[PDB]
GROMACS .gro file of C-alpha atoms in nm:
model
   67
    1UNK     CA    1 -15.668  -8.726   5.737
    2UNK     CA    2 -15.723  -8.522   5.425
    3UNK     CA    3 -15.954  -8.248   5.482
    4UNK     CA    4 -15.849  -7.946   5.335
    5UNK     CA    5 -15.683  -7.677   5.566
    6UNK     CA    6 -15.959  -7.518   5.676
    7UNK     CA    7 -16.081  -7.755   5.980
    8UNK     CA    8 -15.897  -8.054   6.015
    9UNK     CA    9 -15.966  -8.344   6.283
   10UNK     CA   10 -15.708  -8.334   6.587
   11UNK     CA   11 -15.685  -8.653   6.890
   12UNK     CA   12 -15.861  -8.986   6.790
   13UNK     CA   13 -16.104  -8.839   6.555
   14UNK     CA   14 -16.233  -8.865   6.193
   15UNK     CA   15 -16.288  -8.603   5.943
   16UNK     CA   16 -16.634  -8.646   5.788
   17UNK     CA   17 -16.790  -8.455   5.450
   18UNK     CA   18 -17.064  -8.208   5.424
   19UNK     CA   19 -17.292  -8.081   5.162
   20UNK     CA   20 -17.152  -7.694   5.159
   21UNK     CA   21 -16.784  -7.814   5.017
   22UNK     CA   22 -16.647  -7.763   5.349
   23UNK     CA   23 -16.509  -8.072   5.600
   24UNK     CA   24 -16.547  -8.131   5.985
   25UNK     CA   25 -16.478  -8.301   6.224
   26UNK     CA   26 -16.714  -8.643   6.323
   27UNK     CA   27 -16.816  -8.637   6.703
   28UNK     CA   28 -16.826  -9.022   6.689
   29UNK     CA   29 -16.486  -9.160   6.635
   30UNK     CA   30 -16.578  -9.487   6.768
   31UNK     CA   31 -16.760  -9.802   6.761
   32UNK     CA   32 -16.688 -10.086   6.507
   33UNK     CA   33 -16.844 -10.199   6.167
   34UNK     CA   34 -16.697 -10.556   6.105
   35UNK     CA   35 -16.866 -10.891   6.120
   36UNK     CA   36 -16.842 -11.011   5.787
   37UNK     CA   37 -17.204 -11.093   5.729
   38UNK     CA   38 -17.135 -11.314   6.069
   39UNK     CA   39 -16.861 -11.547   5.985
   40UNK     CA   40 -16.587 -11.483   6.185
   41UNK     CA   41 -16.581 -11.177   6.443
   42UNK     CA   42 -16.904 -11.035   6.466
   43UNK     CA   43 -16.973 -10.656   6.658
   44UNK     CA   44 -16.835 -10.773   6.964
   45UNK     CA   45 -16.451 -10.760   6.836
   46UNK     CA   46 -16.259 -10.508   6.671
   47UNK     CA   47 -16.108 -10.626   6.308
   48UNK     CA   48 -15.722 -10.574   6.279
   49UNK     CA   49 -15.442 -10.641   6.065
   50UNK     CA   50 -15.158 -10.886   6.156
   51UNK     CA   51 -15.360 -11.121   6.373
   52UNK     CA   52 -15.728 -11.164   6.447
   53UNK     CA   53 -16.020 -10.967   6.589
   54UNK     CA   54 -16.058 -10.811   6.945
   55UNK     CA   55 -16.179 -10.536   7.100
   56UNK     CA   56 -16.068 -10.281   7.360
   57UNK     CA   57 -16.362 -10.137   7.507
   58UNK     CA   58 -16.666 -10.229   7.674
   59UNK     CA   59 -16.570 -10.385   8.002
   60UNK     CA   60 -16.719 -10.548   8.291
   61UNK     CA   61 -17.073 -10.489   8.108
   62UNK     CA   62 -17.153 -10.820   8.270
   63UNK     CA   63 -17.055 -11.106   8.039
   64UNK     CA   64 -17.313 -11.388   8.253
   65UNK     CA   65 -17.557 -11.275   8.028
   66UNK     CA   66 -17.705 -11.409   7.685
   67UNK     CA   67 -17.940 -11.701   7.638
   0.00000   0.00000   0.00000
């Protein structure tokens, strides 16, 4: 997480850019972003290395849904 040393981004976090040459800290270190133009995993799974794509959150958000 290179951000210079004046705020840096502590816990599971992400250190997002500004327009003032100064970094923070991003209050959304979450969600994922791939699907691969819907080929493989879409946004329902999280994409990692060594393996194949799952996620680890979103539970019992009833999965007798869908039509």
């Amino acid at each position: 997480v290179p951000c210079d040393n004046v705020s840096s981004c502590p816990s599971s976090d992400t250190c997002c850019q500004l327009t003032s040459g100064e970094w923070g800290c991003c209050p959304i270190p979450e969600a994922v972003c791939c699907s691969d133009h819907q080929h493989c995993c879409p946004q329902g799974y999280t994409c990692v290395a060594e393996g194949q794509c799952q996620k680890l959150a979103a539970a019992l958000e009833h999965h007798h849904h869908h039509h």
